[PDB]
Structure 1
Amino acid sequence: SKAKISKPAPYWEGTAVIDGEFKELKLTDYRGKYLVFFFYPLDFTFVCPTEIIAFGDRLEEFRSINTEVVACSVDSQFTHLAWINTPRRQGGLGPIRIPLLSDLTHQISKDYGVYLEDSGHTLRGLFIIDDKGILRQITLNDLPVGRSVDETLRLVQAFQYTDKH
């Protein structure tokens, strides 16, 4: 893993589905803003949808504090798009306001230390990157357990508070 707290967050780049289109997306696109960068195991599964939806549905609570959110898994951009176009009824994402980054090669997952060699996908990893691109926080969950939008919010606010004061 290249991910070290208080060091620049490992650079990434790749294709994301953004508002239903394929776009190239870079970590550096987010300079000036805080970024919640998180990995989830696999599209068309179970815990991964709920926590992606929670974040998307509450996106304004981040954007209103100069914070953006990006989600990532090892699935392809085509699978991401198919998942978005799958209605929440059938366990899809439905439309989403958060970019879904594809880590097909696994390079990004490995740089961030969240790749599972034995499974071929990531664990539940979340990274808080500040506006200068420095990594400030790392949350790694074993697969069965989702993350909390409220705890994330609290942490972003705390770093912004201690940044200032």
Structure 2
Amino acid sequence: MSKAFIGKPAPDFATKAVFDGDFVDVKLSDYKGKYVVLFFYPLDFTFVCPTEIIAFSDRFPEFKNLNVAVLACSTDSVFSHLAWINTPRKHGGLGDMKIPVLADTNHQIAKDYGVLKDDEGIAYRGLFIIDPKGILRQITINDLPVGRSVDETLRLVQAFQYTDKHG
């Protein structure tokens, strides 16, 4: 099922996303020549404040500084994404997002990356690091209750960029 393997071309994806309040098309091949952090989350509009997701948006300047693209993804629709983005952060919404938020209503991307929780049709808290040649370098999958660190993600990305150059 899962097509995500270390040292192998990262599973190709093409889907609709919300970026800068607009519906856009996002392909993996668009980021050829750059590092890519693809991260998944379970559900739009959860009761628990989406601080971990917001953290990746607020701190995106640090990733752009490193020439690194960051993509969020869930099994919710683009319409659901836009509504949550249009919900103020003080009301539990996402607010302004500086990164594209991908819709995976297909489940195809979650399936290809092996992060789909089958019985619920939601993605586990997975994070993947793809290099400029489209090769999968890192796999991170968390159970639903536990989020991810921007610091750890930056550590990983920089170490991979370093070792690409110096070994």
Structure 2 length as normaliser, TM-score? 0.97
Contact 2:72 2:101 in 1 (8 A): yes
RMSD, aligned α-carbons: 0.9
The C-alpha deviation readout for 1:101-157, integer Å capped at 9, x for no partner, is 000010110000000111110110000001111000000000000000000000000
Q: Which amino acid aligns with 1:110?
A: K
Give the corresponding residue for 2:44: 43
Gaps of 5+ in 2: none
Q: Find the residue that maps to 1:150 and give its secondary structure.
A: helix
The C-alpha deviation readout for 1:18-69, integer Å capped at 9, x for no partner, is 1000011101111111000000000001557211110110001111111010
Q: For residues 147 and 111 of structure 1, what CA distance do their matches in structure 2 show? A: 21
Q: For residues 33 and 66 of structure 1, what CA distance do their matches in structure 2 show? A: 6
Q: For residues 140 and 108 of structure 1, what CA distance do their matches in structure 2 show? A: 14
Q: Which amino acid aligns with 2:151?
A: D
Aligned residues: 165
Gaps of 5+ in 1: none
Q: For residues 71 and 37 of structure 2, what CA distance do their matches in structure 1 show? A: 6
Contact 2:89 2:95 in 1 (8 A): yes
Q: Which amino acid aligns with 1:30?
A: Y
Q: Find the residue that maps to 2:73 and give its secondary structure.
A: strand
Structure 1 length as normaliser, TM-score? 0.98
Give the corresponding residue for 1:127: 128
Task: Detail structure 1 runs of 4+ shifted over 3 Å in the superposition.
Answer: none
Q: Which amino acid aligns with 1:45?
A: T
Contact 2:49 2:92 in 1 (8 A): no
Contact 1:40 1:48 in 2 (8 A): no
Contact 2:18 2:100 in 1 (8 A): yes
Q: Find the residue that maps to 2:137 and give its secondary structure.
A: strand
